[PDB]
């Protein structure tokens, strides 16, 4: 019971232990540094 | 020398399956061989082990990489054979991996050249097919049938007839019984595909899951699985379902998937001018099959994220807001939009217009009223039945 | 006959040729079953193709005004293989780039939208050289528009087509018609009330009263320029427990 699928070629190219949700590759790594500009850009005007 | 395995092949020459058997190490019996070799049939020489032998003529061809005198002689040589093969019943199955073979070369000879030489050539090709096609289908072949049709189903997606292969299909009986569940799976493959072009989703999600079932798996099967695969993404994608990370972590063919693992990273966030830039980005990736003019077909399923998002986060908004965070140009724009997604069963909600801001809607106490009785009696029958059918399917023992 | 189509397209009036067709058709049933579907792939044949495809042209563009659609759609299809068959010289009359985007425009009329799909993929291989859309973005535009769901460009595409204009324009009061029921039908859920000039603005409504007209047809109870849109317990029990014991 083996056939070869000749027709199907494997794709030829030109060139985490724990499983994720998808928001763990969300990794917009925003937050740590945008906060900081929003806090004291907001302190310096109150 | 090897050529007692030719010998010991032969052998296999007594009854019946023993053929089927006979093929199996056949299909590894190609790894080695040799033009003096070939002076073995030579010296052997019956016509059923003839055909046969041309098998290993072709395979000696295409394995040796010279595909000319490959389809030359599939004609030549074929047409002569193929005539006296028709007689025999045991050598229809024989012929089927030599049909499988003879449209490759040629399917493979377009990617050399163009001719319109190749047009008439291929239409002769696909007509003896549905010949004998229907010849084969009085003879009562299941393998070669089925064989033969994927064959045809393959030309016709070459060529841009989902059409054609559909009613083709709609007076089509399948040989279903007794097959070989890789040839199985090019069907319900090829099946699922046509299918889903046409735009009805629901029932090609199921023809490539029978696809993933029915292929085998080894080593060698992968390209099959990678190649369906990078289209089940893409229904699951289209029928509105996001589907989970690990499949797009699975094997080698994790690397092929990047590109839909990019596209659900734009569909999930319900993004659209990231999803855009994405399709220029990994276009030419996507044409090397015809997955692309499925994925365009996103842009409508981006959107509807995008709002069912917006809806889910906010109880009512300007709609300048909502055209701010989907970016689109018009308010005007929006509540076509909008519109369209609450009819959809999408939002839930209504429009205020003159202020122009949507309102979700919500759950509104009603607990304490008979409300959850009916809610529950209906989910409760509902219930039931599946309870009934359980035990009326449940007869057999 | 075969001056007589001749003098009926270069006549220039459509039920002239119309009428003029069906005594074509018998000359075109001998000849039909000598030059079409053009298997010799012969040279010095080059005419009668060469003639067949504009006769089947003219066929098409009468059987536009005459309601014909369906019928040549058959010649569409007996013409599949005219331009589809690779040549400089066969697939060239620009006869096409109008007749095929009239095809996939009367797809949409038709609200086929398997075989319209079907035909993109179709097309994509031969076309395959295409650039953006040339003329046939029209039809296909006027598609993706409308299944995103932004209409306001759809119409538009409506107005942008008196530039190339033909007859399709009875197409277009076909879509047209075809679009105003979706954002009716999609108001109608959308929320219950509207001032009339709104709903003027929505349908694209150059008029006040056909407004009302309209929301007749569709049976809107209107006021004043603004519309409006729209088992005991003790039984469940015993029917809970009958099934139960069966």
């Given at each position: 019971?083996?056939?070869?699928?000749?027709?199907?070629?494997?794709?030829?190219?030109?060139?985490?232990?724990?499983?994720?949700?998808?928001?763990?590759?969300?990794?917009?790594?925003?937050?740590?540094?945008?906060?900081?500009?929003?806090?004291?850009?907001?302190?310096?005007?109150? | 020398?090897?050529?007692?395995?030719?010998?010991?092949?032969?052998?296999?020459?007594?009854?019946?399956?023993?053929?089927?058997?006979?093929?199996?190490?056949?299909?590894?019996?190609?790894?080695?061989?040799?033009?003096?070799?070939?002076?073995?049939?030579?010296?052997?020489?019956?016509?059923?082990?003839?055909?046969?032998?041309?098998?290993?003529?072709?395979?000696?061809?295409?394995?040796?990489?010279?595909?000319?005198?490959?389809?030359?002689?599939?004609?030549?040589?074929?047409?002569?054979?193929?005539?006296?093969?028709?007689?025999?019943?045991?050598?229809?199955?024989?012929?089927?991996?030599?049909?499988?073979?003879?449209?490759?070369?040629?399917?493979?000879?377009?990617?050399?050249?163009?001719?319109?030489?190749?047009?008439?050539?291929?239409?002769?090709?696909?007509?003896?097919?549905?010949?004998?096609?229907?010849?084969?289908?009085?003879?009562?072949?299941?393998?070669?049938?089925?064989?033969?049709?994927?064959?045809?189903?393959?030309?016709?997606?070459?060529?841009?007839?989902?059409?054609?292969?559909?009613?083709?299909?709609?007076?089509?009986?399948?040989?279903?019984?007794?097959?070989?569940?890789?040839?199985?799976?090019?069907?319900?493959?090829?099946?699922?595909?046509?299918?889903?072009?046409?735009?009805?989703?629901?029932?090609?999600?199921?023809?490539?899951?029978?696809?993933?079932?029915?292929?085998?798996?080894?080593?060698?099967?992968?390209?099959?699985?990678?190649?369906?695969?990078?289209?089940?993404?893409?229904?699951?994608?289209?029928?509105?379902?996001?589907?989970?990370?690990?499949?797009?972590?699975?094997?080698?063919?994790?690397?092929?998937?990047?590109?839909?693992?990019?596209?659900?990273?734009?569909?999930?966030?319900?993004?659209?001018?990231?999803?855009?830039?994405?399709?220029?980005?990994?276009?030419?990736?996507?044409?090397?099959?015809?997955?692309?003019?499925?994925?365009?077909?996103?842009?409508?399923?981006?959107?509807?994220?995008?709002?069912?998002?917006?809806?889910?986060?906010?109880?009512?908004?300007?709609?300048?807001?909502?055209?701010?965070?989907?970016?689109?140009?018009?308010?005007?724009?929006?509540?076509?939009?909008?519109?369209?997604?609450?009819?959809?069963?999408?939002?839930?909600?209504?429009?205020?217009?003159?202020?122009?801001?949507?309102?979700?809607?919500?759950?509104?106490?009603?607990?304490?009223?008979?409300?959850?009785?009916?809610?529950?009696?209906?989910?409760?029958?509902?219930?039931?039945?599946?309870?009934?059918?359980?035990?009326?399917?449940?007869?057999?023992? | 006959?075969?001056?007589?189509?001749?003098?009926?397209?270069?006549?220039?009036?459509?039920?002239?040729?119309?009428?003029?067709?069906?005594?074509?058709?018998?000359?075109?049933?001998?000849?039909?079953?000598?030059?079409?579907?053009?298997?010799?792939?012969?040279?010095?044949?080059?005419?009668?193709?060469?003639?067949?495809?504009?006769?089947?042209?003219?066929?098409?563009?009468?059987?536009?005004?005459?309601?014909?659609?369906?019928?040549?759609?058959?010649?569409?299809?007996?013409?599949?293989?005219?331009?589809?068959?690779?040549?400089?010289?066969?697939?060239?009359?620009?006869?096409?780039?109008?007749?095929?985007?009239?095809?996939?425009?009367?797809?949409?009329?038709?609200?086929?939208?398997?075989?319209?799909?079907?035909?993109?993929?179709?097309?994509?291989?031969?076309?395959?050289?295409?650039?953006?859309?040339?003329?046939?973005?029209?039809?296909?535009?006027?598609?993706?528009?409308?299944?995103?769901?932004?209409?306001?460009?759809?119409?538009?595409?409506?107005?942008?087509?008196?530039?190339?204009?033909?007859?399709?324009?009875?197409?277009?009061?076909?879509?047209?018609?075809?679009?105003?029921?979706?954002?009716?039908?999609?108001?109608?859920?959308?929320?219950?009330?509207?001032?009339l000039?709104?709903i003027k603005?929505?349908?694209?409504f150059?008029n006040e009263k056909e407004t009302e007209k309209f929301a007749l047809e569709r049976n809107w109870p209107i006021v004043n320029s603004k519309v409006?849109?729209?088992?005991?317990?003790?039984?469940?029990?015993?029917?809970?427990?009958?099934?139960?014991?069966?």
């Amino acid at each position: 019971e083996d056939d070869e699928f000749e027709d199907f070629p494997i794709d030829t190219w030109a060139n985490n232990i724990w499983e994720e949700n998808w928001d763990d590759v969300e990794v917009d790594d925003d937050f740590t540094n945008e906060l900081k500009a929003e806090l004291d850009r907001y302190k310096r005007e109150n | 020398x090897x050529x007692x395995x030719x010998x010991x092949x032969x052998x296999x020459x007594x009854x019946x399956x023993x053929x089927x058997x006979x093929x199996x190490x056949x299909x590894x019996x190609x790894x080695x061989x040799x033009x003096x070799x070939x002076x073995x049939x030579x010296x052997x020489x019956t016509a059923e082990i003839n055909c046969f032998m041309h098998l290993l003529v072709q395979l000696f061809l295409w394995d040796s990489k010279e595909l000319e005198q490959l389809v030359e002689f599939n004609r030549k040589v074929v047409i002569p054979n193929l005539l006296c093969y028709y007689n025999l019943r045991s050598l229809n199955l024989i012929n089927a991996k030599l049909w499988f073979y003879i449209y490759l070369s040629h399917e493979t000879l377009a990617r050399s050249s163009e001719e319109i030489n190749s047009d008439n050539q291929n239409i002769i090709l696909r007509s003896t097919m549905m010949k004998f096609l229907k010849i084969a289908s009085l003879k009562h072949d299941n393998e070669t049938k089925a064989m033969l049709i994927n064959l045809i189903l393959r030309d016709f997606l070459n060529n841009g007839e989902v059409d054609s292969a559909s009613d083709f299909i709609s007076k089509l009986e399948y040989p279903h019984t007794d097959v070989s569940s890789s040839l199985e799976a090019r069907y319900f493959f090829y099946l699922s595909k046509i299918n889903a072009i046409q735009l009805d989703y629901s029932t090609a999600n199921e023809y490539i899951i029978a696809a993933i079932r029915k292929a085998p798996h080894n080593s060698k099967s992968l390209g099959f699985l990678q190649q369906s695969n990078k289209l089940h993404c893409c229904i699951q994608l289209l029928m509105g379902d996001i589907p989970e990370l690990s499949f797009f972590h699975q094997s080698n063919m994790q690397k092929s998937l990047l590109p839909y693992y990019h596209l659900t990273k734009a569909v999930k966030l319900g993004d659209l001018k990231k999803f855009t830039s994405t399709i220029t980005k990994y276009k030419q990736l996507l044409l090397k099959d015809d997955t692309y003019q499925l994925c365009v077909r996103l842009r409508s399923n981006v959107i509807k994220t995008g709002i069912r998002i917006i809806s889910l986060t906010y109880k009512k908004i300007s709609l300048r807001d909502i055209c701010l965070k989907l970016n689109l140009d018009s308010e005007q724009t929006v509540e076509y939009m909008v519109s369209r997604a609450i009819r959809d069963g999408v939002i839930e909600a209504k429009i205020n217009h003159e202020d122009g801001f949507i309102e979700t809607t919500e759950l509104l106490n009603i607990y304490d009223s008979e409300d959850p009785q009916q809610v529950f009696d209906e989910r409760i029958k509902f219930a039931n039945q599946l309870h009934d059918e359980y035990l009326v399917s449940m007869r057999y023992p | 006959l075969t001056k007589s189509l001749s003098i009926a397209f270069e006549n220039g009036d459509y039920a002239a040729c119309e009428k003029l067709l069906p005594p074509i058709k018998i000359e075109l049933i001998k000849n039909n079953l000598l030059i079409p579907d053009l298997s010799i792939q012969n040279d010095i044949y080059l005419n009668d193709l060469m003639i067949t495809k504009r006769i089947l042209e003219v066929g098409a563009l009468a059987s536009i005004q005459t309601f014909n659609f369906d019928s040549f759609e058959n010649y569409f299809n007996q013409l599949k293989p005219y331009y589809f068959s690779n040549n400089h010289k066969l697939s060239e009359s620009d006869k096409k780039s109008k007749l095929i985007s009239l095809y996939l425009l009367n797809l949409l009329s038709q609200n086929n939208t398997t075989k319209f799909h079907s035909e993109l993929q179709y097309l994509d291989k031969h076309i395959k050289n295409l650039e953006d859309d040339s003329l046939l973005s029209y039809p296909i535009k006027l598609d993706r528009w409308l299944m995103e769901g932004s209409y306001q460009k759809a119409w538009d595409l409506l107005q942008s087509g008196s530039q190339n204009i033909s007859e399709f324009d009875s197409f277009t009061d076909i879509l047209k018609s075809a679009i105003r029921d979706e954002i009716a039908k999609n108001t109608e859920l959308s929320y219950d009330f509207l001032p009339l000039s709104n709903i003027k603005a929505l349908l694209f409504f150059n008029n006040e009263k056909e407004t009302e007209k309209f929301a007749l047809e569709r049976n809107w109870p209107i006021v004043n320029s603004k519309v409006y849109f729209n088992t005991n317990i003790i039984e469940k029990a015993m029917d809970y427990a009958i099934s139960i014991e069966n």
